[PDB]
Structure formats: C-alpha cells, structure tokens
Scaffold this active site. Sequence first.
Site, mmCIF file in Angstrom:
data_model
loop_
_atom_site.group_PDB
_atom_site.id
_atom_site.type_symbol
_atom_site.label_atom_id
_atom_site.label_comp_id
_atom_site.label_asym_id
_atom_site.label_seq_id
_atom_site.Cartn_x
_atom_site.Cartn_y
_atom_site.Cartn_z
ATOM 1 N N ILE A 1 0.846 -1.275 -0.051
ATOM 2 C CA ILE A 1 -0.127 -0.117 0.076
ATOM 3 C C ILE A 1 1.031 1.213 -0.186
ATOM 4 O O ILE A 1 0.898 2.093 0.926
ATOM 5 C CB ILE A 1 -1.149 -0.048 1.276
ATOM 6 C CG1 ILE A 1 -1.631 -1.390 1.167
ATOM 7 C CG2 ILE A 1 -2.138 1.144 1.204
ATOM 8 C CD1 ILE A 1 -2.684 -1.617 2.344
ATOM 9 N N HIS A 2 1.335 1.767 -1.280
ATOM 10 C CA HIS A 2 1.832 3.022 -1.153
ATOM 11 C C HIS A 2 0.793 3.999 -1.514
ATOM 12 O O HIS A 2 -0.340 3.671 -1.515
ATOM 13 C CB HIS A 2 2.768 3.156 -2.383
ATOM 14 C CG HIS A 2 2.585 2.488 -3.431
ATOM 15 N ND1 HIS A 2 2.364 2.949 -4.703
ATOM 16 C CD2 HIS A 2 2.274 1.102 -3.765
ATOM 17 C CE1 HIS A 2 2.073 2.061 -5.598
ATOM 18 N NE2 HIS A 2 2.044 0.822 -5.164
ATOM 19 N N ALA A 3 1.104 5.297 -2.111
ATOM 20 C CA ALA A 3 0.100 6.438 -2.368
ATOM 21 C C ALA A 3 -0.884 6.094 -3.087
ATOM 22 O O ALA A 3 -2.063 6.430 -2.893
ATOM 23 C CB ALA A 3 0.973 7.637 -2.517
ATOM 24 N N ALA B 1 -3.696 3.751 -1.872
ATOM 25 C CA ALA B 1 -4.049 4.256 -0.212
ATOM 26 C C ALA B 1 -4.933 5.371 -1.035
ATOM 27 O O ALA B 1 -6.209 5.410 -0.116
ATOM 28 C CB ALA B 1 -3.065 4.739 0.282
#
Length: 87
Positions: free
Chosen positions: A13-15, A18
Amino acid sequence: AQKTFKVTADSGIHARPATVLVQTASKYDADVNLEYNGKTVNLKSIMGVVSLGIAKGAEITISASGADENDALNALEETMKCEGLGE
C-alpha cells in the site's frame, strides 16, 4: 463492524492504492479505520494510510462505525478485491 484481510499486492500500500481506499471510505458517514500490527489510522486520510508502510503478506483489519457501516465495509472489501490489493 470490522473485517480482516491479507494484502497481496506486490508493492503493498503506497500512495496510489491508499488513495483508492480513501476515496471509497470518504463516501460514508461512518468513522472508518485501518489497523495494522497494533497501529490504527483514519481510513479517510491518505498520509495516515501511507505512513504504515504496509507491504505484501500483511494482515490488516478494516473497521467502520456509524449509520452506513455495513455498506461501508462491503464497498471497501470490493474495492480491495477488484484492485488485487487484498482479500
């Protein structure tokens, strides 16, 4: 209510992912939280969710509390499954 998932996306879950989760959570009145490893964050905050550095293989719990908590949860579960993020 709450539900636990396993994160299966390679980059965790990176940017980007997210942002997807927050845009869905953002549509509900309930309070929506993401717990990982004993830390709890607002699922309506992108920076909050990125700060966790959630990676592939992680177990996470999502909860919602309020008037649309049960549809909130369903929405998030689908979001998560359609995107290959977790199950």
